[PDB]
């Protein structure tokens, strides 16, 4: 029937863990798309910002608290990897210690990128981690012939 799968695609509960920077665009997105988000109630955790060695146990306790079906979206270069901060005090990505499902490059990403993250995450949630032998197709490979066919762009002396 796959009614159970339909249930999870239609509705998701977001836990916003945006840090010092990179969360103002996430707020810009959240106040347009949407006090409901609550700890130990959500199944989606959008890790944003730079993951630091000192506060990483906090993210690991919040990861442990959520229920069995766990989704994680890494947004920004500072959360996908160490980003620009390849330094003693920053861990090189949140994927070192928690599994991650979707990666959204940028610094900071755009609200439309958050929208496309929900679209790729309902697409993964609708194929059952969601590999299902369908996720080998990649956004690098899916729109490749779209991107290569671009020839002309507006000159940058204009608005």
């Amino acid at each position: 029937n796959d009614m159970v799968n339909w249930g999870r695609k239609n509705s998701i509960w977001p836990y916003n863990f945006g840090l010092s920077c990179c969360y103002v665009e996430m707020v810009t997105s959240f106040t347009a798309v949407h006090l409901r988000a609550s700890p130990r109630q959500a199944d989606l955790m959008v890790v944003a910002g730079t993951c630091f060695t000192k506060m990483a146990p906090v993210i690991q306790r919040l990861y442990d608290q959520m229920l069995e079906p766990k989704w994680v979206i890494s947004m920004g270069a500072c959360a996908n990897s160490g980003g620009m901060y390849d330094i003693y005090s920053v861990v090189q990505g949140v994927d070192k210690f928690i599994p991650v499902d979707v990666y959204i490059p940028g610094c900071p990403p755009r609200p439309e990128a958050y929208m496309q993250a929900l679209m790729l995450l309902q697409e993964s949630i609708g194929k059952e981690q969601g590999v299902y032998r369908a996720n080998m197709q990649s956004e690098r490979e899916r729109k490749r012939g779209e991107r290569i066919a671009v020839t002309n762009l507006r000159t940058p002396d204009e608005i």
Binding site: L19, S20, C21, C22, V24, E25, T28, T31, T50, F52, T53, K54, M55, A56, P57, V58, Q60, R61, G82, M84, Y85, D86, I87, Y88, S89, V90, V91, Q92, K96, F97, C107, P108, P156, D157, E158, I159
Partner: protein
């Protein structure tokens, strides 16, 4: 010129100290900091400072206290033999002057008496010097590690310490299990500060770490409670340490510019201004007038955006948030203009040494004119909505107030210090970036600094900034966007694409880096929050030898325990919201 190497030996303070102590001991360094740098052996530091503290026009505010390694400097002509050094930047407001004091230390005897007794705000500064270096300050009350965890071995700002995470072992979670065991066994040994009260039913220990919104970053403030009173509040900072200062040592002068944008997420080009000004002070570059006006335009736009965010969040937490959410749409318009000029909404990384990255696109004036004519009616709607409101005004009077003396001892600058009667802006006292060719006023709060006064002053400053932005629209002159100088990095790109010598200059400047001769520069600006400065030392190479970033939020967050002692947890949260502190700035 304003970049030439001066000794400042003629300055009156140098002659008063020479009269008082006669000859010897003092070696007046030659630098481009603009201030007099004096070396003073460590056995007389407390005496010397005391003399300056009580001088007939005293140096009331300790701007900065930090250390330098100095071990690897090959060009050391005139300095005494030092293996380490500690610098103290002091400011006299009544003299509008500064003085820098340098104490030399040897590698075997890194010991100096603590300076906290004269200036209390130095306490955390000395703690940072203990954390990042290995100088032990004898007589310090609580000399513990303030940035790294308590089991972190090594002093990260020493040059024998490898900077990058790659040189250490990757996150194999060998230490994650030990941090998990430590966090699970969360108990208080009473070593977290004075902690005079014992851990019993009489005093309750509460982490009180706000992870909610408007917290301006996730931090912990361990609090001792008795009768719902703040017996002792101890912040646990350092979670958002990004190692920007250490990062400055392994990046060229040009490729570091992106790192400046992230000391403060909301600042953008305000954070870039002091860095480019200091690097051009090392290079000896005078920029054209158009560069000055362009930089003023971008800095006042970012200042307007930051002030509008501070006002909106203040009205949201302690008041009615229904109308002020329209400012979110207005902030988008300020952003569409920034990405019209620079390219990207946040972290522009658009300022360069000697100029800017590109010229203004031809439709900038019409967009800025439409925003400047449209905005004042909305600004007056916020002025009526905030000046005339009664509920938060009644709530926001006398809530953790302080005076001029209290702000001075705690290094507090900005809207906090302007809320008292001290008329001190740096844009008028020490004009930079062509502010001396503009007409604007400094609002002032009188003698009481509280939450209503700070927001009213921020609204008045936002109106003066809008007057500056209209003067930028109506008096933008014509000519180049980049200085003509061999150290302007990069060269104009159309010249690079056709001319061989410009191509060679661009080739070596973007690859090896520009070679700045060995000297020391220092610039401070009025930031969106307080006074932000950059103290850069070059050893003659293409990378910085020492980068010190003074952020005011560190001092503003250090000030809370003096004022909030004798208040409720609600007054604490309201004060934390009112004070202009961001975790990224406190931890750089």
């Amino acid at each position: 010129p304003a970049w030439q190497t001066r000794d400042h030996l003629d300055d009156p303070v140098i002659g008063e100290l020479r009269n008082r102590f006669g000859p010897d001991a003092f070696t007046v360094q030659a630098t481009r900091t603009g201030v007099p740098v004096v070396w003073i052996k460590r056995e007389q530091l407390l005496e010397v400072g005391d003399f300056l503290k009580k001088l007939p026009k005293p140096y009331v505010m300790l701007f900065d206290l930090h250390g330098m390694d100095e071990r690897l400097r090959t060009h050391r002509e005139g300095l005494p033999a030092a293996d380490f050094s500690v610098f103290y930047h002091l400011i006299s407001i009544d003299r509008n002057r500064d003085i820098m004091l340098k104490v030399a230390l040897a590698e075997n005897d890194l010991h100096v008496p603590t300076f906290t007794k004269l200036f209390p705000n130095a306490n955390w500064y000395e703690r940072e010097t203990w954390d990042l270096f290995g100088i032990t300050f004898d007589g310090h009350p609580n000399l513990r590690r303030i940035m790294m965890p308590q089991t972190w071995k090594g002093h990260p700002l020493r040059k024998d310490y490898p900077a990058r995470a790659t040189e250490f072992s990757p996150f194999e979670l060998t230490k994650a299990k030990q941090d998990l065991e430590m966090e699970a066994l969360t108990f208080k040994p009473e070593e977290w500060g004075m902690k005079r009260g014992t851990e019993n039913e009489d005093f309750m220990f509460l982490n009180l770490g706000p992870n909610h919104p408007s917290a301006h970053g996730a931090f912990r403030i361990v609090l001792q409670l008795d009768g719902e009173e703040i017996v002792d509040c101890v912040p646990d900072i350092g979670y958002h340490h990004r190692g920007a200062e250490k990062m400055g040592e392994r990046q060229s002068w040009h490729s570091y510019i992106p790192y400046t944008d992230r000391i403060e997420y909301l600042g953008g080009c305000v954070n870039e201004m002091p860095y480019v000004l200091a690097v051009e002070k090392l290079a000896g570059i005078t920029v054209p007038d158009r560069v000055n006006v362009i930089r003023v335009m971008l800095s006042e736009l970012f200042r307007i955006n930051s002030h509008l965010l501070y006002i909106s969040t203040f009205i949201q937490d302690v008041g009615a948030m229904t109308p002020v959410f329209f400012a979110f749409t207005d902030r988008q318009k300020i952003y569409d203009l920034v990405e019209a000029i620079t390219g990207f909404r946040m972290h522009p990384a658009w300022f360069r040494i000697g100029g800017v990255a590109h010229d203004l696109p031809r439709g900038w004036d019409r967009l800025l004119r439409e925003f400047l004519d449209w905005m004042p009616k909305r600004l007056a709607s916020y002025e009526k909505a905030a000046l005339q409101n009664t509920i938060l005004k009644g709530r926001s009077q006398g809530v953790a107030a302080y005076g001029a003396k209290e702000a001075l001892e705690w290094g507090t600058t900005g809207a906090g210090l302007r809320a008292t009667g001290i008329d001190f802006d740096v844009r008028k006292a020490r004009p930079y970036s062509g502010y001396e060719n503009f007409d604007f006023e400094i609002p002032v709060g009188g003698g009481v600094s509280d939450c209503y006064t700070r927001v009213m002053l921020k609204v008045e400053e936002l109106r003066q900034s809008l007057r500056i932005l209209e003067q930028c629209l109506n008096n933008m002159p014509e000519g180049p966007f980049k200085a003509d100088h061999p150290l302007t990095t990069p060269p104009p790109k159309e010249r690079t694409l056709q001319h061989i010598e410009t191509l060679i200059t661009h080739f070596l400047q973007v690859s090896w880096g520009p070679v700045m001769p060995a000297n020391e520069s220092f610039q401070m600006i009025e930031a969106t929050k307080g006074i932000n400065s950059y103290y850069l030392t070059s050893d003659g190479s293409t990378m910085s030898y020492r980068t010190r970033v003074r952020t005011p939020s560190f001092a503003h967050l250090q000030q809370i325990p003096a004022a909030i002692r004798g208040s409720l947890v609600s007054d604490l949260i309201v004060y934390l919201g009112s004070i202009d502190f961001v975790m990224s700035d406190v931890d750089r």
